[PDB]
Design a protein around this ligand. Structure first.
Ligand code: CA
Length: 1028
């Protein structure tokens, strides 16, 4: 009984918020907070008179407008501002001239309106006991004489408590707790939304303004990715996470080169050790930065390593791209393949045919065609775009599914967890991994890895979490796939080479063949070394596969393999798979004179598990078998060395037998735990295991990003501290260990890898920086991940407090410091003109500390739309440093009386700063609502649509009973339902999205249909193909 009322939306099953229901002259407004219905709106525009008591009035004035007198950010005041008054009412009794240290909250003496003053009183009473807790609530409607009486009493009681406790800490805490309970001062006014790449619930893009000139930029060219160089197209999302670096600013670009050089010379610079440098880069978040960076990195590598000279030259520095967009490969190829594109068409073919559940996988035929490379008869070299490929990665079918397991095991929201939670989720995740029916883990990991590692024209990348359990100390526990995948890896070195043929038969069974080194076509007879090389693969994704009697699967081993003995590498069993790491006790099969192997529904020569049929177990759902020639020498190596012959084209990597001889190891998971001893340190264990990785044929070890985590908990990366979320770009376990160890552990890992003949990859992360400690006022607009204005947000060209100043001691020590050396050693880098900026990089300014001018924007910070304090008509308070000096009445000697919104008779008027009545104009109140004063200067409030032209612009508006322009919501009337946009104007004849909601309005503005996208409402796994 006695509950609230709501209007349940038919598509959300939840209350409509900010929704007006009208029936004749009667109405219910359903509120913003919970959608609870009311028919009594409060007047929001009322200030009410300053202290009539002159001792309070004069005593509470600001001592001065100096920086030290009034807490501020670039001269702007915030809800948290404390200030020095002329006098304090000491111990509640004795007006006393203030000391410099006598700071008091501005909210002790000032409120944006009477609504907030009443709420302040209620709060200070209930939670501060600064009024008798017995008092009834102050209604918004309370007159200013009553409100002022009780805020003066609160002031007395604050001063008594300051005297009795000898402290103001309690008051700092209490006032900030009040602040955060006001929607104008919290996330409720920030239009939280998780659509697209709003991973943290929304962005604020930085814009130029006379209000914040020190934060202006001539650059901020956004979304300028591979398919949007000129900005005339859509491009990738500029915005992703945290503070988005403006990589279109030429000074920032020089700094990215500076950092790049630092990474590539890390051991030299920090350890006097040229044996402890990185050899290549991974470019993080490619489709979220100015694509100029690909050419800047290219140019540096060309200058320092002469990449384009030959294959031997390029292959000494394997670089890779995190480039998700399906049109990226053509562009990467065009600029010279300076970093390897991924082949996302190929990975998605694997996802679609092998990695899903039995009732979900598609026909295997797609593996032949859906890729940068057609593999039906891949018999040529240097003919395709070179690329790398993978089955999983730290952020690909790992982090989202692991968070799903944690959520399932703990009941906590997606992404929220402590270390105990993480371990409990990991136990469930690993139990799932070892099940036949998997909820969170990919199926057919053995078959997926077989395709990965036997494909021609591909640099495969192995994922750490497929060899070792994702969560645990580094390499603490092996997965069930460790033996299978390391068997494939060693077999790949020894046998996998030459041409490829892939086919799928009428039973949907896939056959994959490699001929061995020296043979490219099925008809080639090969060389001496070809004979005991090559591989044959049989794959099905059909758990019910049954061949009729007399039906066979034929592997066409080719003309180099006539009348030859083969032995098994992997066979599928009832319970899993069997691995054979060499010829000993492996089952055998013989080719005929055409080079064909013949398998059927029956074991060959009484050898267990040589029949082809469907299985369903935790390894295989379908069928897998792999065969190689018997009798290879123990030291057989089918790989090809890169030629040092001069390139005839302007390319680094070429897709050929030498590039194919490389394997990348992504040597981390996000869910590595912090080590409990020095011995458990990831980089310590990497150094100790260099020869192990070599034995798998790893040629480049991709290390995690080594940057010390911000540990701010604002994204997964700064919860599990993987190194992608950092404040100091140059701090690689240097001020304190990273999760992987100290900078000495890192240099030791690089040196040990080099000693074993492996390369090491530096994760280059130019997109963003986290957790800068210095505040800066910036003019911003709430925007989507492409910087498109969020139409329903009031945050449009609004001053907001950002955290953009800082960068740590190592950015300060090293930022810009290698530019002079780079200019003298590689001068050509400084005269290149880049395609997006159409200019050179700009090394004339060193970045030693970041500030807002260098960023495109920020994730929303939950400070609230109105945190920066304003009066009526959009006017900002300011000390006078960033914009016109203007202080609240209570702090100045100016009297508020008769200015702003004023009642006369049954009407309200608005008087401007010259005390003149405003007519036929829109005017904003201090908390951001909008009003229209008509031709007579009367506030409009008739809740029936009204046509207004304001500066040659039509609009149909609706003004609620309290005068406020209704906006960003629906109105249901007797005649239909209507939608008013973020500017208060009725929408007609279109489809509009309002956050999670989509509404279709006909020519008359009537709602025809609506839909709900729940994923806009909270953090969520990113949908497959979201980023293609
Ligand atoms: Ca960006």
């Amino acid at each position: 009984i006695n509950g609230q009322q709501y209007y349940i939306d038919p598509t959300t099953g939840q209350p409509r918020k900010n929704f007006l229901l009208q029936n004749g002259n009667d109405w219910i407004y359903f509120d913003k907070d919970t959608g609870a219905g009311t028919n009594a709106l409060k007047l929001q525009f009322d200030k009410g008179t300053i202290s009539a008591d002159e001792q309070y009035r004069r005593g509470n004035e600001a001592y001065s407008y100096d920086d030290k007198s009034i807490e501020n950010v670039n001269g702007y005041l915030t809800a948290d501002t404390w200030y020095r008054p002329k006098q304090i009412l000491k111990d509640g009794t004795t007006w006393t001239d203030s000391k410099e240290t006598d700071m008091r909250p501005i909210l002790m003496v000032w409120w944006p309106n009477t609504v907030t003053q009443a709420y302040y009183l209620n709060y200070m009473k209930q939670y501060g006991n600064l009024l008798p807790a017995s008092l009834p609530s102050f209604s918004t409607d309370a007159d200013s004489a009553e409100l002022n009486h009780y805020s003066e009493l609160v002031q007395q009681n604050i001063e008594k408590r300051i005297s009795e406790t000898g402290s103001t800490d309690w008051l700092r805490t209490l006032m900030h707790e009040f602040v955060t309970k006001n929607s104008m001062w919290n996330k409720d006014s920030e239009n939280v939304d998780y659509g697209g790449l709003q991973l943290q619930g929304g962005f604020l893009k930085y814009v130029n303004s006379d209000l914040t000139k020190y934060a202006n930029s001539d650059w901020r060219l956004m979304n300028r990715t591979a398919t949007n160089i000129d900005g005339k197209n859509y491009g990738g999302a500029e915005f992703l996470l945290a503070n988005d670096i403006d990589n279109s600013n030429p000074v920032v670009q020089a700094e990215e080169l500076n950092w790049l050089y630092y990474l590539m010379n890390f051991g030299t610079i920090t350890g006097n050790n040229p044996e402890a440098n990185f050899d290549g880069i991974r470019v993080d978040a490619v489709d979220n930065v100015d694509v100029d960076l690909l050419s800047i990195a290219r140019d540096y590598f060309n200058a320092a390593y002469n990449m384009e000279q030959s294959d031997a030259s390029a292959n000494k520095h394997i670089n890779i791209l995190e480039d998700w967009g399906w049109d990226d490969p053509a562009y990467v190829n065009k600029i010279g393949n300076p970093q390897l594109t991924m082949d996302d068409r190929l990975r998605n073919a694997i996802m679609d045919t092998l990695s899903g559940a039995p009732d979900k996988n598609q026909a295997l035929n797609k593996l032949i065609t859906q890729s940068l490379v057609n593999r039906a008869n891949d018999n040529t070299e240097n003919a395709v775009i070179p690329s790398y490929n993978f089955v999983r990665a730290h952020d690909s079918n790992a982090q989202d599914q692991i968070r799903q397991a944690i959520q399932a095991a703990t009941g906590k929201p997606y992404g929220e967890f402590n270390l105990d939670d993480e371990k409990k989720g990991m136990e469930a995740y690993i139990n799932d991994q070892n099940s036949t029916n998997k909820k969170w883990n990919l199926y057919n990991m053995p078959s997926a890895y077989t395709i990965l590692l036997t494909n021609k024209d591909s640099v495969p990348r192995v994922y750490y979490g497929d060899l070792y359990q994702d969560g645990g100390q580094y390499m603490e526990h092996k997965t069930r796939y460790f033996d299978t995948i390391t068997n494939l890896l060693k077999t790949r070195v020894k046998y996998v080479a030459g041409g490829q043929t892939m086919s799928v038969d009428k039973n949907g069974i896939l056959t994959n063949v490699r001929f061995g080194k020296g043979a490219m076509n099925a008809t080639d007879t090969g060389t001496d070394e070809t004979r005991t090389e090559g591989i044959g693969v049989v794959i099905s994704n059909n758990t019910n596969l049954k061949l009729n009697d007399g039906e066979s699967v034929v592997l066409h081993m080719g003309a180099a393999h006539k009348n030859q003995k083969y032995r098994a590498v992997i066979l599928t069993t009832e319970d899993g798979v069997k691995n054979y790491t060499n010829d000993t006790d492996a089952p055998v099969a013989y080719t005929d004179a055409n080079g064909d192997l013949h398998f059927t529904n029956t074991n060959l020569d009484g050898q267990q598990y040589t029949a082809v049929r469907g299985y369903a177990n935790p390894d295989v759902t379908g069928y897998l078998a792999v065969w190689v020639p018997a009798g290879a020498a123990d030291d057989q190596d089918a790989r090809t060395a890169p030629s040092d012959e001069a390139h005839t084209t302007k390319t680094a990597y070429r897709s050929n037998a030498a590039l194919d001889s490389n394997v990348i190891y992504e040597g981390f998971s996000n869910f590595i735990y912090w080590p409990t001893t020095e011995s458990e340190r990831t980089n310590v264990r990497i150094a100790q295991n260099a020869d192990l990785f070599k034995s798998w044929g790893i040629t480049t070890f991709e290390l995690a990003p080594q940057y010390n985590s911000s540990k701010d908990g604002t994204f997964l990366d700064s919860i599990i501290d993987n190194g992608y979320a950092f404040t100091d770009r140059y701090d690689l376990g240097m001020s304190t260990p990273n999760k992987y160890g100290s900078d000495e552990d890192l240099r030791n890992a690089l040196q040990a890898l080099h000693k074993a003949g492996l390369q090491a990859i530096a994760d280059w992360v130019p997109d963003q920086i986290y957790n800068l400690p210095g505040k800066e006022a910036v003019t911003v607009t709430r925007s989507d991940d492409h910087g498109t204005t969020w139409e329903v947000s009031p945050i449009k060209n609004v001053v907001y407090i950002t955290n953009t100043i800082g960068g740590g001691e190592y950015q300060k020590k090293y930022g810009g410091e290698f530019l002079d050396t780079l200019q003298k050693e590689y001068p050509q880098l400084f005269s290149q003109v880049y395609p997006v900026t159409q200019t050179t990089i700009d090394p004339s300014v060193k970045i030693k500390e970041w500030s807002a001018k260098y960023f495109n924007g920020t994730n929303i910070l939950h400070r609230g739309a109105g945190y920066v304090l304003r009066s009526n008509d959009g006017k900002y308070y300011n000390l006078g440093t960033s914009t016109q000096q203007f202080l609240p009445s209570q702090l100045s000697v100016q009297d508020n009386e008769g200015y702003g919104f004023v009642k006369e008779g049954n009407n309200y008027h608005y008087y401007d700063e010259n005390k003149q009545m405003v007519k036929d104009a829109f005017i904003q109140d201090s908390v951001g609502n909008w009003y229209y004063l008509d031709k007579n200067g009367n506030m409009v409030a008739n809740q029936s649509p009204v046509e207004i032209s304001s500066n040659g612009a039509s609009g149909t508006y609706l003004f609620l009973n309290n005068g406020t322009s209704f906006r960003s919501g629906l109105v249901k009337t007797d005649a239909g339902t209507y939608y008013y946009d973020g500017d208060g104007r009725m929408v007609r004849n279109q489809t509009v999205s309002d956050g999670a909601m989509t509404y279709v309005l006909d020519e008359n503005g009537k709602l025809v249909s609506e839909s709900f996208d729940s994923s806009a409402t909270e953090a969520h796994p990113l949908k497959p193909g979201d980023l293609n």
